[PDB]
Amino acid sequence: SELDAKLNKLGVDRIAISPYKQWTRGYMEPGNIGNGYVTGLKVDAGVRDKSDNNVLDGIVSYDRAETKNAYIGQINMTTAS
Amino acid sequence: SELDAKLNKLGVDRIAISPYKQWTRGYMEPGNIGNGYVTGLKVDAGVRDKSDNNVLDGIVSYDRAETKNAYIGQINMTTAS
Amino acid sequence: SELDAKLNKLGVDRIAISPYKQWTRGYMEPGNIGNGYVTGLKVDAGVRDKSDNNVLDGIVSYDRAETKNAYIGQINMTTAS
Amino acid sequence: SELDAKLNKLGVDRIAISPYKQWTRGYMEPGNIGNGYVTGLKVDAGVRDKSDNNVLDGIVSYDRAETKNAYIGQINMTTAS
Amino acid sequence: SELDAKLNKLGVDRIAISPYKQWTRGYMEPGNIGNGYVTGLKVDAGVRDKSDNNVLDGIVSYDRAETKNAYIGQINMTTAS
Amino acid sequence: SELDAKLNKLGVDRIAISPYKQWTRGYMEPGNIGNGYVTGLKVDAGVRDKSDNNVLDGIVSYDRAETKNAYIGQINMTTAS
Amino acid sequence: XFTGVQGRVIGYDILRSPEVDKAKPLFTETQWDGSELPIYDAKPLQDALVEYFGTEQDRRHYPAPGSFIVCANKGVTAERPKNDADMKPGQGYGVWSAIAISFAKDPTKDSSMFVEDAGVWETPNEDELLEYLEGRRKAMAKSIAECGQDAHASFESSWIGFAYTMMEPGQIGNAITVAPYVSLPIDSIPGGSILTPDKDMEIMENLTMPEWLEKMGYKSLSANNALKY
Amino acid sequence: XFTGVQGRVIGYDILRSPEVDKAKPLFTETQWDGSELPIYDAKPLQDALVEYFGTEQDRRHYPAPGSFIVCANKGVTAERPKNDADMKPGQGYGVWSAIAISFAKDPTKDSSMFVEDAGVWETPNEDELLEYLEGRRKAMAKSIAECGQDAHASFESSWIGFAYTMMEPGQIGNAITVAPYVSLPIDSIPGGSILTPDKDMEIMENLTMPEWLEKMGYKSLSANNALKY
Amino acid sequence: XFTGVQGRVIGYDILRSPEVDKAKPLFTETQWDGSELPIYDAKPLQDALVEYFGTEQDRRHYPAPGSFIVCANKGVTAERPKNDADMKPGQGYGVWSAIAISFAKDPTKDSSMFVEDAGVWETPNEDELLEYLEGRRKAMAKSIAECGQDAHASFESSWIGFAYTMMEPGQIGNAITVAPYVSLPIDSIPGGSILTPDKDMEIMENLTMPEWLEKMGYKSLSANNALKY
Amino acid sequence: XFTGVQGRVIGYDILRSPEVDKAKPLFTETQWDGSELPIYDAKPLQDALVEYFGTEQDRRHYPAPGSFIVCANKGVTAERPKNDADMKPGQGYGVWSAIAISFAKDPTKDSSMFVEDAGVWETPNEDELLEYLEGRRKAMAKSIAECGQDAHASFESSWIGFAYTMMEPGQIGNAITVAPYVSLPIDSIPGGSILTPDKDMEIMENLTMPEWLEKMGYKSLSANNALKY
Amino acid sequence: XFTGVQGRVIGYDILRSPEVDKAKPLFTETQWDGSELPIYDAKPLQDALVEYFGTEQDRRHYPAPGSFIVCANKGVTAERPKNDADMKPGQGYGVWSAIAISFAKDPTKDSSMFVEDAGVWETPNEDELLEYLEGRRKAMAKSIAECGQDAHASFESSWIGFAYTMMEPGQIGNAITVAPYVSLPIDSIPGGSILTPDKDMEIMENLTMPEWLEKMGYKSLSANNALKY
Amino acid sequence: XFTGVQGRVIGYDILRSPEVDKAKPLFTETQWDGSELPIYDAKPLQDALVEYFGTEQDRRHYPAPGSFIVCANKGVTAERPKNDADMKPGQGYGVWSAIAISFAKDPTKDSSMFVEDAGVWETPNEDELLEYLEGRRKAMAKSIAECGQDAHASFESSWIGFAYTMMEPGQIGNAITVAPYVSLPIDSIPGGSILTPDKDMEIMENLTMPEWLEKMGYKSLSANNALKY
């Protein structure tokens, strides 16, 4: 849009394409086309029956949360802040 | 320098260029030129008036700290250790 | 293998080459060839004599652990989960 | 146009960009962007006072012809047929 | 084959792929993959009813020859020697 | 040199590298690095004992000429003018 | 966090859901520059992402199995024991997470910004819980403004949503807020092509979420509020 | 030659000069498939290229100094001596060149085709000369059809033009017909950008030659027939 | 976490150690789909990585100094004071970490998955400690199944190992579990070449760990159980 | 021209036609190094190319419409008038072209070499004509050796073929000899993929022409000598 | 963390500030190899980065809005209540962070290393606080040596700095130590060009911080100790 | 042709042979702009190329076997029969070729230009022949100026050389003039690297031909006029 037109003059582009069929890909992953990124908002929560293994309890809750609603299944999640 | 000359024979290069105008870019970000990186030392601290919302109190203190002195403004900060 | 043959039709490839001599490189690092990754299993532990500086105590224990057995020496470790 | 849309599915694209400022470039020359070509129609003729050196007489006539009208000045002309 | 293995050490590779569907492409054409070439042997001849226009008589005979047998139809033919 | 510095601002560069070991390569050949070219001056002549086959007589004379002095041996020679 | 010059937001910049040009501000916050910053419930944007990725059941354009998706995220985990009056320290009856996206007036200087939060809930009164959240916005809107101030950034809108859950006795809860940064696949873009990178985006910039689903042959999963987070 | 799947023609596909949608056929030729192939004087297309590249004086988007432009070309050179009745063999009073571009009905199977020609002229009567050319078209149109036949190609239009010159006594003439194959520079494309490759073409596909000159601030050099070849 | 479509595992998919086709399951877990999921001690895979990277002393194909290796990891740190009966809260006599890799039956839909864990130990009885771990597998095998269920993923095998250590009085211990994601260097691949990317992998896919060491001239460091983690 | 380090020949190096390992030398020529150079009729290789590209009718993997195929080539054109005893200078009853490919013993130093020729025929006795050609080989074999000598190149085999035609009275003939240099498309390679460049060649290196046709579902057009050039 | 083969440090390797070749060691630490490791206050390097990125007010070559800058970092947050004698557990009057960079003698084997730390302060006596820090170096220098020992790394210098702040009653403090890893923009490099990648670095390798500012037309913000962290 | 913005000349721009800064003009030609254009014998440049490529015997950095070198070239072939007084038309006792390189004063507008020529010689008096050539320069210098005029190009120098040969009775001669356009290999550049593209040229720009040979360990083949063309 009229915006990109101002960025392209600064050397910025917002093209973000995934060479994969059907699947979306993480920004920075190799083989992606374009130097931009698309982002979204996902908030959700999940529960698991308390065993003694805290970590595992969290891993699973987290897993059930990722899987809930907007599916971001078997993803290696990096963290930025 | 005389150093790069030894690296280039190992397959290493330290060129790190940002295709953007005026702005620096994160290592690994696409569109960067060269397979190296430039690093620096920033230590600073900031404060915010204690509300009840701890997270938010931290987010802001962190924000005021990033903004202090060596400016690393609106940056998505990844963590390595 | 017979597998890649099915992925290549989806747009996926698992080639992961490091242009460096002898050294392995992190997935996503620039200059790597191919859009895949090789992974492994490292579990180890290390100890350091308790000083007062907790962080430093940890940094070192961590360092001695990385260095133990399967060597992943002077590495900037990113975290995914 | 509606056409390219059918070619792109065959693996053909007709983008032909010259990284140079103001100047057009020969198809196949390195650094060009896109895998297509733009072509045109130039017909012209030029004369030179007959010396004994035939070749030279032709070189110049040819030169004066290239320079006439649609200017294709100091060009290394390859030939296809 | 065992041969390429000796070339790859000299910096030579003989991969020559055409990104097009079904069609072969000229060596040096952009978008081709690999730095090699595949060549073949085509000898043929064609005739046309003598008009006064020599050039045209040749253009057509040439055209009928290209089209004969091993088809190299609507090709822009460059010449090397 | 001070010159390139003016070209680089026009989008022109004169880097011309051959990924091959020891051998020079033709401008436009794939796998070459840089968007420039290096050129030289070769003038020579060769002779062959007149058989009936004119073409072949020429092919050989030409061959002996290419091979004479500045060696441009087994080269596919394109022509520009 | 942020989403600046190199980004667009699903549902907003691309695949826009009309809910945006039909939503009304819950209130406003005074930005340092002296202008107001309307606040909206981020429900539209949240639902939008759901349409695109799909769900575990009706899967769509989700991330490749084993891919590395960088996310601006945060979370929280707490324990709700078996009735037990002694509810230790970091325990509760429910858990929640919140997320906010603020778009800059001028994307060419200022990056749009994300502000997330999460926490544990103390009263089994879910009904109550909501009230807390309904107030939290004001809390966030404040920090947001402060950050803006910190970098002299100025936003025009700001959307915020949440997610919560009551853990059953003996159940651990995990509340997450997360903004993923991806690249889009070809087949998810109508009439696109691997050879028309910039054009492919323009298509998305133009297609409204509704149109997209139709042109793709996807039933709207967000339907009429069919989704609770 | 040819100009197929990978190409467009200045003045026609891009930077189209209205002269096309205002020109009338000089005659028709029966293609093997049984349909007619109208023939037009290629004047528009020739003038068009001139606008783009510019001239030695009013230079524009010409090829980079020392570049390698591949061209589908041919030429001819002859001598016109000092009156001399003995006019040897390959001598004459003038020289000419001709070029034709035939667009295929279906560019996805058949490539559009170039057909050039050139020759020497024998009578100092220039006026006459033209008549010859005016007929030559028919000659070319025939070969064209034959080639079409050779590959089962079918065209819709076909444009042909020429260039000639009378050599003064003792002057060598060189007539050339040439189709160059280039890539376009950024600044010649209005509102384009090195980062929007495919979009940059679409712009050209749409801009008519007139508009282009205006949007670029270029005076029309082709003016009203201001150019003779 | 995961290791899907874009990945292979050292020792398993590439540089396979025969220990795999000679190992027996410690037990099985019922997957949602109703099939069993055998569990093996991940010892082979662990030793394998060691052969490849090398050690601080016998260094081999370790990561470049200062490289950025992304790792699916976790860890734990605890204090063991000087005898002191008052052992504060997060203190203990030893610390441990565990890791599990589960391969999907169909890698084209489901990604293979990592599941790690770590913790502090309370009784100075190391001998005891092991028993705990020997049970932990069952614990992990359960979560694993649950996750599988969460995404309808189905695995065929699953390998798990650990690492532990008893801290001396006054020694802080750090137990780590970590899966690194790398690219392989040329010289580590026999008869490979920078110009034969896909072929280079095929070589690794075929070479068994034993052969590799021999063809490379490397002595087996894993030898006969020479390695304790 | 030549075909060196960067090349392979259809029918020989790739898509090999068994005709090669069943052909016998027509004679030998003494190379400067003192070894013999067997000569074969290039019929197999010629037919091979035909199978790959296809014909105007049964089209296969021919060059893209409007592509630029560089070719090591040469040709000849002559006129055969209407009976006319006065047969001017460059006129004749038929025209011919010839081509030769000589492979170097050591492709890593010496490039393999092409040697082409063409000419006009003088006696309407076609039967005679062949005799001329049948001798021409010896003529070429000589030049070939000379060139080899010129660069200290040494070949092992050398294949030569021709093409001729008798022009009807008033018919212009055009005899062409041409070696094209191309890249192969994906679909022409069985089980290949745009992502496995080097592997794709290995496939071709291995597949014999026969197998190829079968695996591709192509009927052999070369059949049993079905082709005359 | 580390900064090895692929890196350079602002102020040191590039844009060197003379403060380096004028600084004196605060003390030394015995490295495993038996040599000393001088320690300097990292003030120069800290100021240097400031000159390059600029500040919120005098902005310069800071990171693009919304970019993803990976940083080797750590931090700390604590509460200083309203006078309140009951100062809970993780509370204090001030907070601090520290950072150290150790360059290896031989960058071709050993990577240069970062070592950071942070903490909360307990006595409102700021003056006191400094003394703590002034000692902390020795603490770090020790760990540093240990790590070196861990990988048989040997350094030549080592620079360490800090940052602190006293929180007002009721103010939360956040102390951060952070090493960013970036790529440099073109305009920040004098006489550079997007087409001269390797040369562009050489320029920076040579330009001293002073020169840079002048050649760029930048006033020195670090001035004479104008900066307090 | 030409050699413009994208080029450099062996012996002149790179690997410069001192012979240049020691040569004196044979004469001058008046350029359209009114300045003189000194003319030199191109001997230095010719010898230079020889040093680089090597000869059939002492081979050096010649083109890869089977490569495609584009060359601005021309040639000539003639027959010298067995004494025979009837010397047909295109026959003679010797044959020659000539080449000229003119550098523009301002390479940023004007491209440097090549001008070649060739021909057959008529008198067996070789000694005479030279005189012809010695005059030909003046002939070329004229055309050169004309072309310059044609494009408003202005040169500063201009170097011209030749090559000739007397054919024995019954020997066909082939005189060639040729300018090749190449890319340089790594090993021919001292202290260069595949990773330092632009730097690699700068090295060549600086190294004089003499130094080069020494630094490379090459004996000067051009020696003292050791080469006759």
Ligand SMILES: *N[C@@H](Cc1c[nH]c[nH+]1)C(=O)OC
């Ligand atoms: N955008 C981050 C928080 C942030 C804002 N300023 C610095 N950090 C986010 O909201 O959480 C991931």
Ligand SMILES: *N[C@@H](Cc1c[nH]c[nH+]1)C(=O)OC
């Ligand atoms: N397009 C070429 C001629 C041609 C047509 N078919 C084969 N060759 C042209 O017209 O001249 C360069």
Ligand SMILES: *N[C@@H](Cc1c[nH]c[nH+]1)C(=O)OC
């Ligand atoms: N694979 C991660 C954990 C995981 C599984 N599902 C979501 N997260 C791991 O085991 O730790 C790094």
Ligand SMILES: *N[C@@H](Cc1c[nH]c[nH+]1)C(=O)OC
């Ligand atoms: N290979 C060329 C001829 C050749 C051999 N040596 C120099 N030139 C061919 O045979 O004709 C195109």
Ligand SMILES: *N[C@@H](Cc1c[nH]c[nH+]1)C(=O)OC
């Ligand atoms: N460089 C890291 C710490 C480190 C050193 N060895 C392993 N880890 C840093 O100082 O903190 C980000």
Ligand SMILES: *N[C@@H](Cc1c[nH]c[nH+]1)C(=O)OC
């Ligand atoms: N440079 C070419 C001739 C030339 C000059 N102007 C147009 N053409 C050369 O000298 O021959 C290859």
